Design a protein around this ligand. Structure first.
Ligand SMILES: *[C@@H]1O[C@H](CO[C@@H]2O[C@@H](C)[C@@H](O)[C@@H](O)[C@@H]2O)[C@@H](O[C@@H]2O[C@H](CO)[C@@H](O[C@@H]3O[C@H](CO[C@H]4O[C@H](CO)[C@@H](O)[C@H](O)[C@@H]4O)[C@@H](O)[C@H](O[C@H]4O[C@H](CO)[C@@H](O)[C@H](O)[C@@H]4O)[C@@H]3O)[C@H](O)[C@H]2NC(C)=O)[C@H](O)[C@H]1NC(C)=O
Ligand SMILES: *[C@@H]1O[C@H](CO[C@@H]2O[C@@H](C)[C@@H](O)[C@@H](O)[C@@H]2O)[C@@H](O[C@@H]2O[C@H](CO)[C@@H](O[C@@H]3O[C@H](CO[C@H]4O[C@H](CO)[C@@H](O)[C@H](O)[C@@H]4O)[C@@H](O)[C@H](O[C@H]4O[C@H](CO)[C@@H](O)[C@H](O)[C@@H]4O)[C@@H]3O)[C@H](O)[C@H]2NC(C)=O)[C@H](O)[C@H]1NC(C)=O
Ligand code: HEM
Ligand code: HEM
Ligand SMILES: *[C@@H]1O[C@H](CO)[C@@H](O)[C@H](O)[C@H]1NC(C)=O
Ligand SMILES: *[C@@H]1O[C@H](CO)[C@@H](O)[C@H](O)[C@H]1NC(C)=O
Ligand SMILES: *[C@@H]1O[C@H](CO)[C@@H](O)[C@H](O)[C@H]1NC(C)=O
Ligand SMILES: *[C@@H]1O[C@H](CO)[C@@H](O)[C@H](O)[C@H]1NC(C)=O
Ligand SMILES: [Ca+2]
Ligand SMILES: [Ca+2]
Ligand SMILES: [Cl-]
Ligand SMILES: [Cl-]
Lengths: 79, 466, 104, 98, 52, 104, 466
């Protein structure tokens, strides 16, 4: 299960271009993959905790929204 | 080459020509008298024609104290050392002060009443003698200055006449600025335009140009759409005051005898406070009192105020509607459909297209007053932009702004923050029941009226010098 | 201009210590856009008959007021959120700010 | 053989992707990664489509902001090339790895 | 947001217009500082040093 | 002025159809910032002795040129990436653009 | 009072006062003559004083055709219908045309060297008489116009004089615009400043003001820092031309006799092309030739160009250095240290502090030329901002811009994009070896000089009328 490589180098390059980055080093992609993995781990852990507390086997959008809001990353558009 | 009697288009006369089938003027040979504004420097073929502003652009209550040294000196009471302003030596309003009479060779005031023989009034501005509401305002401000000087003399007996005059004038100017920028402009522009064009005050830019724009003198005439066709007078119970409770506006122009011999300024102030204004609608712009019978008594023929506005805009050489929409960063319509979408009234767009032929040729006043009003506002986006820019420049570019450091002390600023036009009306008149906060919104008696004693008073103890 | 002053001058001078004539009385207006006259500098539009503005004839001001501004008085709509005090203070503030003199 | 400069197409992409609102990461790989990560906390988990969409939006916004901060850090060091030390410094100052 | 949509020659308000309205206003940006708007994009801004 | 034209007017009139004066010859300059005169409108700084600008005395232009501008000619360095053609074309362009007349 | 001979401060004289211990003027009661610029409209106590621009602000090669109807009519070759420009009727440069002679009551050119008695040249500007390089430029442009008219007549025999003259003038103006905005301005502002202030051309704003700013007339004098103290002449082999290969600049002011009697304009153009300009440095601003001996031969006393610039900036009422830094959105220093960091020079900042006292009082020219030069540019950020703004307004506000739609056909624009100043030089002079591309950057022989049979010529085939 190696799915962190699913975030390809062109995708990271596109995300950097949206951020105004002109030139990218070759070692940036691994660092970005690690940062994304850490962020997703935290958010998903909080969402799964919220889901278990609700006695459910399905992760809903409200759980993710609450998990993001708990981290000071309020997200608008999903409830 | 007298413009008020001759219709020949010779300078400085720029008469208005009568279109065919005019409802009021049946003779095309006649015309509306009109005077071109004085050029900045006459006879110059090199400079583009520009107009002169005869008053200080700052909000410094120059309508009470004047903008020229001889007039300002003549407006004061030099018979003493209390620093008061001159008051009427012949008439009083129930024992209260009245504006001094003014001596002009051609006085329109005695033309309305040839029996009263009451001349025009003397104030900081020569237009103070139109119409009894404005005269009531001028008298109220005069009384307020006199009362402030009296209280300051009571607090500081060591101060001389010049010091009393200067301090009272400072307080009156600060009061005018506070009332204008706290009660009036939010209602004019609306919260969106107020926040966009007049942000929080920070400090004094000396780099901001405080001059009055040429377009502002024609964009601020949006108030001609708020004019009611009557003058209302109310008694102590805010009931119609007999006789003549509702007087046509054509019978009040340049009529100071109504202020003098008809009960003073208290009924006029009550009517101003307790009467709704006129809403500006795209099919109801200006009443016929100012459109057909303006200055009828004092002139050979009635004037047309909107027509005068647009003819003055043409005389001043102002750009068209599209140029000012581009100036303010707004989309500029080009066809009848785009103009209808912008104006939200398609029939008005057809009428404007028929009259002018292109949106670029629409006069600034007409396009400004034909636009839909902003939410919680009374001007269109273009007029709101112009007015907000001008007042932001007048506020940030003023060195003696009351909030600027060094002008008023912190205690003085906090004391001035407690003022209100209702309190001034309570203090300087015999009116005991007065509308609540935001006097420009309360208009129905007795739902939004309180007793005069509940209004906090201005505490001048911070002005004591020791 | 005096180095120190406590109060405004009546004529409005010396308010801006860099350009003392800014905002004073008896001074020319400031133009936010270049002027648009018939001949370019002095003649207003509609002075000479037959001259068009931007390829279109200039409408008479009285005709525009007759066609658009005119409306029956009896259909006047009162303002439930404003009073005549609003309009009166507007006129008073306007007389505070500006005045364009004309020849006698 | 018209070849652009090594900086023209980068600026073109910067202008193109700063004017759009789409998602820059393919949806299926991100969904697979999210499921693989969630496998570490609770087995036999079901995901709503809106949940995965919200996770993707939050991750993309976080990465874009981090890359803006990283660009600021790189410009501070008199450079135009984005390097991992810039990311580490930005994360420290933000308070994430601090 | 409606002003932003009009500036883009659009009839409807989409989340992009909401993001443009929020991020271009200093006080609204301060209020919604830690808030992410879905499908809002980012403000077009390129650093000066990166320009040719 | 004519609605349709094919060539420039020698004076510059009606280049801008809305405001024909804009850009023409024998016309006043535009002001990006308000003028700063000694008396406010006409007198230059340094006219009447003893009047200070921004609280500081007005320096003589010749004194400033003597102190700061002056440098030994023999220590002149040439521009390796420019020629005198650069400054000559600059002067020609300046003479194309503007010329402020003075009384005889 | 004659400002040339007197030293009193009466209008319209604004003489320069001599500081104590002047290195050249040992008499403190003496003065440097100075004339105040003509006001826009004189004698007015209302309008703020403004100056007059006597030329068209557009880049239309008005230095060759003139900005007034009578001068333009006098400058033409009206003896026939070939649409040519008037040439000199007494002297020729090896069979080539010369500028027509002028007729002035007082002729500065005659004073320079009286035996020849050669008056000033007549052209589209009154200042072409100064400088043999400038006279060479004017002669080259006149020859180019004549050649263009001849070629157009050859292609289209049916065209009359007026059409030929107008078309040749159009092509000359387009060439001037191309050379200015493609070769000169990038070398002035630099890459980043050119990109910031002069982006790619899009279309024609009629809402952009094309007027020349008052500050621009003083800011564009940065070229006084690029003036070499001598005049150079190289022969066909690009070797010094005997006699007088290196003549002091004080002997060439209004010395048109040198142009007429010393080899024409070919050696002058060779010297311009094959010599390096002076580098502007914070301690090497301006040379002594224009600092002590300006107009030495014609005037009673040598003028001083930088002091003239400062006195003109004061005469025009221009704001100070800090005001223009604020205008361009740049930080405004207030102390000696802040000015030192701004200028990257603590000693120069200290000298400026001692001379002026505050950065708010530093003249626009002095502060602008004291700033460090931009990368690959020749101006500081403030001067770059002012110049870029002015030229952007000139380009966007010009209806007859060469890239504007409807001015030229696509084939005509394609042909015009190939022009270059070295090509003009070869077509209109006898020089057979000219500098490479970007003549403003190539200054070394024979490295940067090529045979100009290799430079493509302008193709007029697209101008043929079918
Ligand atoms: C053709 O050019 C037109 C003019 O172009 C000018 O010159 C060229 C060479 C460029 O430098 C260009 O940038 C110049 O503007 C151009 O129309 C111009 O459009 C701009 C942007 O919409 C207008 O600016 C807006 O003006 C008003 C008022 O503010 C100004 O005036 C007051 C008083 O003088 C000053 O105090 C201000 O500082 C400004 O100078 C405002 O509505 C607005 O500011 C507010 O709004 C914006 C967004 O709405 C906010 O970001 C701000 O913070 C404010 O809240 C703008 O400043 C400009 O007036 C207008 N010029 C003219 C002469 O009408 C046009 O777009 C070009 N055409 C094309 C097709 O590109
Ligand atoms: C005190 O106020 C000063 C003036 O304030 C003005 O009036 C008040 C009431 C407000 O409306 C305020 O917004 C107004 O600006 C203020 O100084 C002002 O600072 C601005 C921003 O620095 C200056 O604008 C810059 O000007 C130049 C030139 O462009 C202008 O002029 C030309 C010619 O008229 C026009 O064609 C243009 O459209 C502009 O109008 C430029 O250098 C610059 O634009 C470029 O640079 C910026 C980066 O700095 C980029 O973002 C732009 O895209 C451009 O690349 C600015 O437009 C303004 O000239 C200046 N005004 C004056 C009178 O000096 C000051 O900041 C206030 N002080 C404090 C402490 O608050
Ligand atoms: C009794 C009330 C009023 C009278 C007699 C009156 C009449 C006039 C007349 C005849 C003019 C000259 C031509 C012109 O309109 O441009 C004028 C100008 C003007 N009006 Fe009014 N109007 C009244 C109400 C108002 C109101 C309510 C406002 C604003 C809220 C206003 C604002 C102005 C301004 C700013 C001017 C410019 C001054 C000038 O050009 O001399 N007026 N007024
Ligand atoms: C041989 C070359 C030059 C001569 C004889 C010369 C001389 C002069 C003189 C006498 C003035 C008027 C002084 C004053 O009004 O204060 C002047 C102004 C001026 N100069 Fe020069 N200068 C030369 C080089 C340059 C260069 C290289 C440039 C630009 C690149 C330039 C640009 C200007 C401008 C724009 C003016 C303003 C016109 C005016 O003030 O009336 N000059 N020059
Ligand atoms: C001046 O004030 C006194 C009271 O101090 C009053 O009696 C007198 O009438 C006033 N004079 C004028 C001209 O207003
Ligand atoms: C004129 O004033 C007198 C009082 O002096 C009054 O009786 C009369 O009615 C007035 N005239 C009109 C027409 O209002
Ligand atoms: C006009 O051109 C002809 C032919 O080139 C020439 O001989 C003549 O001298 C010119 N006239 C003038 C006045 O320069
Ligand atoms: C003046 O002109 C004559 C030619 O007529 C020339 O020989 C002489 O050298 C010139 N004078 C100077 C001082 O150069
Ligand atoms: Ca005032
Ligand atoms: Ca020109
Ligand atoms: Cl205006
Ligand atoms: Cl200026």
């Amino acid at each position: 299960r190696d799915n962190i490589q699913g975030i390809t180098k062109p995708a990271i390059r596109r995300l950097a271009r949206r951020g105004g980055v002109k030139r990218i080093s070759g070692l940036i992609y691994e660092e970005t993959r690690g940062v994304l993995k850490v962020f997703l781990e935290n958010v998903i852990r909080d969402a799964v905790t919220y889901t278990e507390h609700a006695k459910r086997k399905t992760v809903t959008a409200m759980d993710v929204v609450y998990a993001l809001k708990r981290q000071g990353r309020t997200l608008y558009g999903f409830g | 080459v007298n413009c008020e009697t001759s219709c020949v288009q010779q300078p400085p006369c720029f008469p208005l020509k009568i279109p065919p089938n005019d409802p009021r003027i049946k003779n095309q040979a006649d015309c509306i008298p009109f005077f071109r504004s004085c050029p900045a420097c006459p006879g110059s073929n090199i400079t583009i024609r520009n107009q002169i502003n005869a008053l200080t652009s700052f909000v410094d209550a120059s309508m009470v104290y004047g903008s020229e040294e001889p007039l300002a000196r003549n407006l004061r009471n030099m018979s003493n050392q209390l620093g008061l302003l001159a008051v009427n030596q012949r008439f009083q309003d129930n024992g209260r002060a009245l504006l001094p009479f003014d001596n002009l060779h051609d006085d329109p005031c005695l033309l309305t009443n040839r029996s009263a023989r009451i001349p025009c009034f003397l104030a900081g501005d020569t237009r103070s003698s139109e119409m009894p509401e404005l005269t009531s305002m001028h008298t109220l401000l005069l009384r307020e200055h006199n009362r402030l000087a009296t209280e300051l003399k009571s607090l500081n007996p060591r101060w001389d006449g010049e010091r009393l005059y200067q301090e009272a004038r400072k307080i009156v100017g600060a009061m005018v600025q506070i009332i204008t920028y706290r009660d009036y402009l939010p209602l004019v522009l609306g919260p969106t335009a107020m926040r966009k064009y007049l942000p929080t005050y920070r400090s004094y830019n000396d780099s901001v140009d405080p001059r009055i724009a040429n377009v502002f003198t024609n964009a601020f005439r949006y108030g001609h759409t708020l004019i009611q066709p009557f003058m209302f007078r109310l008694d102590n119970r805010y009931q119609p005051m007999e006789p003549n409770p509702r007087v046509p506006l054509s019978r009040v122009f340049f009529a100071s005898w109504r202020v003098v011999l008809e009960g003073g300024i208290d009924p006029i102030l009550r009517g101003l406070m307790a009467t709704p204004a006129k809403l500006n609608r795209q099919n109801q712009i200006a009443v016929d009192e100012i459109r057909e019978r303006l200055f009828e008594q004092v002139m050979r023929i009635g004037l047309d105020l909107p027509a005068l506005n647009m003819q003055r805009s043409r005389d001043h050489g102002l750009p068209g509607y599209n140029a000012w929409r581009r100036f303010c960063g707004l989309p500029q319509p080009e066809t009848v459909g785009q103009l209808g979408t912008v104006l939200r009234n398609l029939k008005l767009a057809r009428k404007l297209m028929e009259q002018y032929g292109t949106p670029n040729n629409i006069d600034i006043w007409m396009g400004g007053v034909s636009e839909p009003l902003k939410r919680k506002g009374r001007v269109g986006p273009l007029l709101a932009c112009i007015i907000g820019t001008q007042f932001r420049k007048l506020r940030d570019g003023d060195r003696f702004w009351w909030e600027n450091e060094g002008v008023f002390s912190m205690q003085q600023r906090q004391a001035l923050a407690q003022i209100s036009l209702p309190r001034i009306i309570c203090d300087n008149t015999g009116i005991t029941t007065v509308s609540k906060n935001n006097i420009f919104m309360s208009n129905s008696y007795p739902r939004d009226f309180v007793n005069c004693s509940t209004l906090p008073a201005l505490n001048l103890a911070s002005w004591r010098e020791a | 201009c005096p180095e120190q002053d406590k109060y405004r001058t009546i004529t409005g001078m010396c308010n801006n210590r860099r350009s003392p004539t800014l905002g004073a009385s008896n001074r020319a207006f400031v133009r936010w856009l270049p002027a648009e006259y018939e001949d370019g500098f002095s003649l207003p539009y509609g002075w000479t008959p037959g001259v068009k503005r931007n390829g279109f004839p200039v409408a008479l001001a009285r005709a525009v007021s007759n066609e658009i501004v005119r409306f029956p008085t009896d259909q006047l709509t009162p303002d439930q959120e404003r009073s005549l005090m609003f309009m009166q203070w507007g006129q008073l503030l306007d007389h505070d700010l500006d005045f364009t003199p004309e020849p006698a | 053989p018209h070849r652009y400069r090594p900086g023209t197409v980068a600026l073109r992409e910067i202008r193109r992707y700063q004017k759009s609102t789409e998602l820059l990461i393919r949806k299926l790989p991100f969904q697979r990664l999210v499921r693989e990560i969630a496998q570490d906390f609770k087995t036999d988990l079901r995901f709503q489509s809106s949940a995965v969409m919200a996770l993707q939006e939050a991750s993309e916004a976080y990465l874009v902001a981090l890359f803006e901060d990283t660009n600021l850090c790189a410009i501070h060091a008199k450079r135009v090339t984005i390097m991992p030390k810039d990311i580490q410094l930005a994360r420290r100052i933000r308070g994430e790895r601090a | 947001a409606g002003n932003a949509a009009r500036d883009n020659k659009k009839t409807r308000i989409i989340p992009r217009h909401l993001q443009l309205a929020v991020r271009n206003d200093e006080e609204l940006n301060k209020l919604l500082g830690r808030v992410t708007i879905a499908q809002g994009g980012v403000l077009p801004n390129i650093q000066s040093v990166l320009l040719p």
